[PDB]
Structure 1
Amino acid sequence: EVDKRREINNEHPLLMMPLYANGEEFNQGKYTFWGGDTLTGKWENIPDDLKPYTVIQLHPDDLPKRDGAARDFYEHMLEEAAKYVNPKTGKNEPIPVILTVYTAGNMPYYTSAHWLSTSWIDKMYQKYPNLHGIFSTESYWIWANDIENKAADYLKVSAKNGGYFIWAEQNVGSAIEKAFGKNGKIAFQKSVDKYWKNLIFMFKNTPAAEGNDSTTESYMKGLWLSNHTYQWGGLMDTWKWYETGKWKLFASGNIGKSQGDRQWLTEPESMLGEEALGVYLNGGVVYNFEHPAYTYGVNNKESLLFSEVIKEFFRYVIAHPAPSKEKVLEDTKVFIHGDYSNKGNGKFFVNVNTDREQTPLYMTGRYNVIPAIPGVLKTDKLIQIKEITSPEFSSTQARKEYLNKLYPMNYEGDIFAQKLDNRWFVYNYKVNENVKQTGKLKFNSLEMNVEFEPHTYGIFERISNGLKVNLNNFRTNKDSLWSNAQDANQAKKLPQLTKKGAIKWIEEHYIKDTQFGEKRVTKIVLRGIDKLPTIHSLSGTNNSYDQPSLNFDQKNHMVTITINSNGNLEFELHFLEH
């Protein structure tokens, strides 16, 4: 094996930092990105603690669809990245880069990436030590006749140079199954047999109306556990709100795919953290997001979604490495072999661990994510390994009856919760319904009851001297975007915000003059404690929380903690048990 250019694993996770080429400005002789970020400026603005775990991902977006455009733009930016000088130290510190090399089947009518040869990619790897990988994203809807062959070549050229091939794809139209040879195109299967240590496979949750979130994530996890990918992760996309026809938060009615640039701004910020937990809690280590203007920011400035949710989440997964492959393997009780495409796709998990067909969330952590690999792959080398065609998986009820025998019930209440070591992870799983959820969790004899509004997650760690709490319910008010529409009919008919309009809205009304959401209440009740706990190390989003209220009831050895907040929040409670 050629020495790897970087590590990507639980201890060295990866946050991809997208920069999308501005093709309109390219036609005017400029080298710029949509949203006004610059390569150097974006890198400089990444906190120094995150720099070792963050890589700039260039994307060719709307560069002209002709030979040379993407090479020109990419060479220009690789040069900028290579020559970067840290102004504090005066040292040349080449900026790490991933290039988007394949998208939309690389059709010449869809992308400038068509004209990026494997020869050119090899040349770039050899010229730029700071080129750490190449990225393929979103071809499920245009499954080119040579897509598997090209993916093999991308993986091989990456392995040859110590780089990673990273593929973000969703199991629409059997995409993941076909990638590994379902329909007889086996070149990528064979490449992975050799070069899996240089592959990263990610979900891409954009096509939310097709409901393949749970099954794609199941495959990413199973491919990883079975050594068909070095690591896995996910690209979580606020465009899901567009794809599913939602509009104003909690409003009635569906507007369809009619207001895209308003719609990709509307997903609650903290919901991205809820999605990301599904990656982390299942051993995934690679994270990416769209739309970049909302999820990361503009003009080399962090959006509040980035600063209050994504940045803090990513810091958490660096501080608490995700469960290792070995650990996840030990914990896996059932591993599915076969094609979700033959068993209802995402419907497979509805009312097993998802609450509806179109959601990126889970309603229980009891089974965590059940890992699977497509039927084309083998289970010889790879726990009960079960064919997807088994009677145990024939119906919703059968699945639960079987899984429940192997995965015991470990909490109470209609809420998402999952436990790792001494940590309960909890979130309200409602997507667009304004409904509180409650759960009862235990740390041995200590009882913790929680009440969460939608778009709220928490991490509760039993430490020797009490409990460490991380809470995030950050959700700004997007109603301005939907003003002048009292119903779905009117909302569908609003003037288009447009891409440029949405970027400008972020600049003028999100980066500044933000319409923050209202503070809202979280309740935490601890039963079985000796004395009034003390609170320590309280911090969170500025101006976003009231001082927590602790009400201790001596007779019943319990405390009720009431929090009123809208943001990220951390604190410790110190106490002993009774």
Structure 2
Amino acid sequence: PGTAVENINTNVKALRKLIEAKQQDLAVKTYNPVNNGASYTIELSDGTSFSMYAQIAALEGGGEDVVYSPKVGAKVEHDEYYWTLDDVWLTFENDEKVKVLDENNTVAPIVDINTDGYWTVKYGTKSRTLDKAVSGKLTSQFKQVSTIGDESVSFTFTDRTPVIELNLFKGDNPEIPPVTGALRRPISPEQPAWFVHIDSWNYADPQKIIDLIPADIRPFTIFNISLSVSHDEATGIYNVSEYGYEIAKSWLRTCAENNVWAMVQPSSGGFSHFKDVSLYSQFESDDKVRVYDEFFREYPNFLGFNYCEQFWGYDDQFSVSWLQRVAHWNQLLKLTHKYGGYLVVSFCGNTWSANINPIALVKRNSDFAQTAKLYSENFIMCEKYTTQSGFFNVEGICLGTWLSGFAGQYGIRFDQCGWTEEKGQNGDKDFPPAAGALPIIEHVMLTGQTVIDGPELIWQQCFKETNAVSVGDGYQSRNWECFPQFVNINIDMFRKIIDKTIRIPSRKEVIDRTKVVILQDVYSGDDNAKYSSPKNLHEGLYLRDDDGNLWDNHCYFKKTGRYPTIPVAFELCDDVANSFQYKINQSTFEGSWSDVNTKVGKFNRWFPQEYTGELYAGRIENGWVVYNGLAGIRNAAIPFKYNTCDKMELAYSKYTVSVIKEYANKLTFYMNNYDPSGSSKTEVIKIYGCTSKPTHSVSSRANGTAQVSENWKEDVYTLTVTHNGPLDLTVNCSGKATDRLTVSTAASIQVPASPQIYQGAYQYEAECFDFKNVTKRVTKGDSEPIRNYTAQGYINFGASSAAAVRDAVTALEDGVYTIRIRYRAPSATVNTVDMYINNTKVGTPEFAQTDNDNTVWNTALMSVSLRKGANTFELKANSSGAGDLYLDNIVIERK
């Protein structure tokens, strides 16, 4: 959006305002570069906010060269600023100069193109025609804003307009010391984490996504503030998340206010809202990258940055090389470590991205490798299921990153998108949500994942905005709901972690179960040879008969669980890593292990057979993950290792997953197969070798249905389980065996502590206010003409006598607060809107007429008493407005 001419005039009006701010000694309160400094937002101390453009939109019509455009600058003579045109005095008729500040006029010279295609400049009733305007790229009259010492802020221009220096606002409240040192929010088997997205694509009200997470889950949740990298190809400008900084800031404040942990996700490919660094020093001394230190310093609940699907979109005009991104991570991990945060990376692969996978990450970047090793506690590596192939290759490597000591936690970011295009799997073209439970439960339980991220797509599998709903007193409000699969698969699965059914193994427990690791020591050949796992590594182990090797591996369901996920690492960094029983150098792999039959033989000696059948069954201690990844009813015969009976025989429907806990005289089964459309599945369970009549009991979970029939005949107990969705089934069954293992003491789950209380300003977006009788609600601002808003939109409150907005705000304590209302009133002052706090009128804000420009906002202040806890904010028209009133947000702050 936004034309050349609008950009040009925006800068003219900015110049006037800067010169007025100079003379009135206004300070710059804040400034922020956007789209890599293509533009900046400026806030002054009087509440005026506006944009300046270092880059100008091309003049329509598709010229490719740099062409002329009028440069309206300003120069001082005899103590006063006068306007320039292309570095000569701007004159009209008189040859008389025109003063920037005249107090008569409030209108700056306006640049335009007339009907004959000539540039024009107008001031008052006076007009001058300049050169023909030809289509092409233009240059700005404005260069950059930057900070000098830490006293001052300098605006620089491209045309001999002198530097304009303004004071930087020395703030009046005392500094809140940040959380530093220890991890802010420890993650472990005892304290798993779910990264739940507050997503730009849901156009979220952060408060409403937060409140969709039930109370028992919230303390284990880390809210992932997700900025989309959707952008215009030609200019680089972000659309969906036009203002990343502003989105992240607003949603992080809401998180902080809610006392919930949060991260920001500024990057999907190479693409990022925030500039990459090369030197640690930049975090404090470079005004282009303030965001990194700011979020850590100001929000004790902030944990850090999430760089997702780091496999694509490098070396674009508007992104960095992958090498640059790693050098960024090298410094950011240091910053992260200081503040006790996490840097999260996720990876999904293809054949072209071998040289940027988690092996290459450390094997090609020795400096990063060193930092990673030193600060591993602060670094989290996640397998992502977004691509079409290589699932086992990428699983093994992401696991290897953790087990080898380069990453301190291992996670999964599951995604519907990894369902094979066209044909799907098992004859199912469309992705069935039930499929998604299988890798998550398997990799958590058997490979020690402490982080679950998503699942994706957030806006299809997790949350959706509905139409507005009534909320009382004539107001409506935006509404979000959970997708049924989120409740019936993801929330319920996490509860099964919390309730100790699904015990997560520690790194050391995983290493001892896994036994074997491949070390990627190959420096000859192509990128796959040097960074990917051996082609045929999974063949004849857990690769399905209908699926192929490496980049022909299109299915993430394992054929058997006899063999652990096979980790692949670069190097083993610490003594724990070096305790692996079997170390295979990949350079020897083609020699010995590439012959499938030879490998299966040696693996079959290391890993004994503990069941038979076509189901996936894998065992850790007294716990089994058993699932059906194939079409049709599939079966397993599993001798008991802890239960005193003999064996269980299982017959499971397609996509039925189960976690089975063995006890001496008891079995539990967590079972799920959730279909949103309500189909019923049949499973069968047979226990052999009972020495008395068993009993059972069952409870459906979430929105699930179940019915269980039992049968005792000969010495065989059969349970037939009809269900949709999740259930817990208990079987009380004992036999004679004395040669059984002993169940461990109950595992530890520790509800993670809350963050430190946030002492800062709270923010509330108008586009999230409850409303009635407003002109327009802009929930997606990028397509509309107003710039320089916060979060993803704003509203046009409009001029109706019946117009009103409401919101629920909070206060830590009773006392006096400033409410800053960020508004626009572009055609006349508005004095017909009253503010209510807790259903009592507290005053009439002075919505003073603002400049016409598309970039200009201002702020009206009000002091009120709030009480501790929940308060009601309202703005209500009492009569027709003299003009339209736009609202962006309110900011509430202790006075």
| TM-score category, normalised to shorter length | 0.7 to 0.9
Mapped to 1, the partners of 2:417 and 2:274 lie a distance apart of 22
CA 1:171/1:213 → structure 2, altered by over 3 Å: closer, same or farther? Answer: same
Mapped to 1, the partners of 2:275 and 2:731 lie a distance apart of 56
Q: Report the counterpart of residue 502 of structure 1 in structure 2.
A: none
1:571 aligns with 2:729: yes
Q: Quote how far apart the aligned CAs of 1:136 are.
A: 0.6
Q: Report the counterpart of residue 428 of structure 1 in structure 2.
A: 628
Residue identity opposite 1:328 in structure 2: V
1:203 aligns with 2:406: no
Which string of whole-angstrom CA distances, capped at 9 and with x for unpartnered residues, describes residues 202-253 of structure 1?
0111112xx2211211122222222111110111110112x5333698358x
Residue identity opposite 2:421 in structure 1: T
1:463 aligns with 2:666: no
Mapped to 2, the partners of 1:309 and 1:115 lie a distance apart of 37
1:558 aligns with 2:721: no
Q: Report the counterpart of residue 183 of structure 2 in structure 1.
A: 4
Helix, strand or coil: the match of 2:671? Answer: strand
CA 1:447/1:248 → structure 2, altered by over 3 Å: closer, same or farther? Answer: closer
Contact 2:710 2:717 (8 Å CA) reproduced: yes
Helix, strand or coil: the match of 1:112? Answer: coil
Mapped to 2, the partners of 1:100 and 1:398 lie a distance apart of 45
Residue identity opposite 2:583 in structure 1: I
Contact 2:373 2:407 (8 Å CA) reproduced: no
Q: Quote how far apart the aligned CAs of 1:48 are.
A: 1.2
Which string of whole-angstrom CA distances, capped at 9 and with x for unpartnered residues, describes residues 305-354 of structure 1?
11111111112223333011121122222111116932766653133212
Residue identity opposite 2:434 in structure 1: S
Mapped to 1, the partners of 2:704 and 2:383 lie a distance apart of 35
Q: Report the counterpart of residue 341 of structure 1 in structure 2.
A: 528
Helix, strand or coil: the match of 1:192? Answer: helix
Q: Report the counterpart of residue 398 of structure 1 in structure 2.
A: 598
> Which residues in structure 2 correspond to 1:17-166 (within 5 Å)?
17-21=196-200, 34-35=201-202, 37-62=204-229, 65-66=236-237, 69-84=243-258, 94-106=259-271, 111-114=272-275, 118-143=289-314, 144=321, 145-166=323-344
Mapped to 2, the partners of 1:162 and 1:138 lie a distance apart of 24
Residue identity opposite 2:509 in structure 1: K
> Which residues in structure 2 correspond to 1:521-540 (within 5 Å)?
521-540=682-701
Q: Report the counterpart of residue 634 of structure 2 in structure 1.
A: 437
CA 1:407/1:251 → structure 2, altered by over 3 Å: closer, same or farther? Answer: closer
Q: 1:385 aligns with which of 583, 586, 597?
A: 583
In the TM superposition, structure 1's runs of 4+ consecutive aligned residues that sit over 6 Å from their partners are 376-381
Gaps of 5+ in 2: 1-179, 278-287, 315-320, 466-479, 548-552, 737-895
Q: Report the counterpart of residue 437 of structure 2 in structure 1.
A: 273
Q: Report the counterpart of residue 549 of structure 1 in structure 2.
A: 709
Q: Report the counterpart of residue 170 of structure 1 in structure 2.
A: 348
Structure (1/2) with the larger strand percentage: 2
1:315 aligns with 2:495: yes
Which string of whole-angstrom CA distances, capped at 9 and with x for unpartnered residues, describes residues 397-456 of structure 1?
3322221121111111122101122222101122xxx32211001214521000112111
Helix, strand or coil: the match of 2:563? Answer: coil
Contact 2:615 2:635 (8 Å CA) reproduced: yes
Residue identity opposite 1:70 in structure 2: G
CA 1:118/1:245 → structure 2, altered by over 3 Å: closer, same or farther? Answer: farther
Mapped to 1, the partners of 2:695 and 2:670 lie a distance apart of 16
Gaps of 5+ in 1: 22-33, 85-93, 253-265, 477-514
Residue identity opposite 2:537 in structure 1: F
TM-score (norm 1): 0.79
Residue identity opposite 2:182 in structure 1: D
Q: Report the counterpart of residue 78 of structure 2 in structure 1.
A: none
CA 1:127/1:346 → structure 2, altered by over 3 Å: closer, same or farther? Answer: farther
CA 1:62/1:225 → structure 2, altered by over 3 Å: closer, same or farther? Answer: closer
Mapped to 1, the partners of 2:199 and 2:451 lie a distance apart of 19
Which string of whole-angstrom CA distances, capped at 9 and with x for unpartnered residues, describes residues 56-111 of structure 1?
10111156654982112211222222233xxxxxxxxx3321001332112xxxx5
Which string of whole-angstrom CA distances, capped at 9 and with x for unpartnered residues, describes residues 152-206 of structure 1?
1221221121110000012432222464343x33332122022111001001111
Helix, strand or coil: the match of 1:548? Answer: strand
Which string of whole-angstrom CA distances, capped at 9 and with x for unpartnered residues, describes residues 480-537 of structure 1?
xxxxxxxxxxxxxxxxxxxxxxxxxxxxxxxxxxx32x21210111101123322225
Mapped to 1, the partners of 2:348 and 2:425 lie a distance apart of 27
Contact 1:66 1:115 (8 Å CA) reproduced: no
Contact 2:359 2:569 (8 Å CA) reproduced: no
Q: 2:653 aligns with which of 445, 449, 453?
A: 453
Q: 2:452 aligns with which of 287, 309, 334?
A: 287
Mapped to 1, the partners of 2:410 and 2:498 lie a distance apart of 16
Helix, strand or coil: the match of 2:683? Answer: strand
1:226 aligns with 2:404: yes
Mapped to 2, the partners of 1:268 and 1:423 lie a distance apart of 26
Contact 1:148 1:179 (8 Å CA) reproduced: no
Q: Quote how far apart the aligned CAs of 1:392 are.
A: 3.5
Contact 2:265 2:308 (8 Å CA) reproduced: yes
Helix, strand or coil: the match of 1:349? Answer: coil
CA 1:200/1:472 → structure 2, altered by over 3 Å: closer, same or farther? Answer: same
> Which residues in structure 2 correspond to 1:228-243 (within 5 Å)?
228-241=406-419
Helix, strand or coil: the match of 1:348? Answer: coil
Q: 1:329 aligns with which of 497, 511, 525?
A: 511
Contact 1:548 1:561 (8 Å CA) reproduced: yes
Residue identity opposite 2:273 in structure 1: S
Mapped to 2, the partners of 1:346 and 1:277 lie a distance apart of 26
Q: Quote how far apart the aligned CAs of 1:129 are.
A: 0.6
Percent pairwise identity: 21
Contact 1:148 1:186 (8 Å CA) reproduced: no
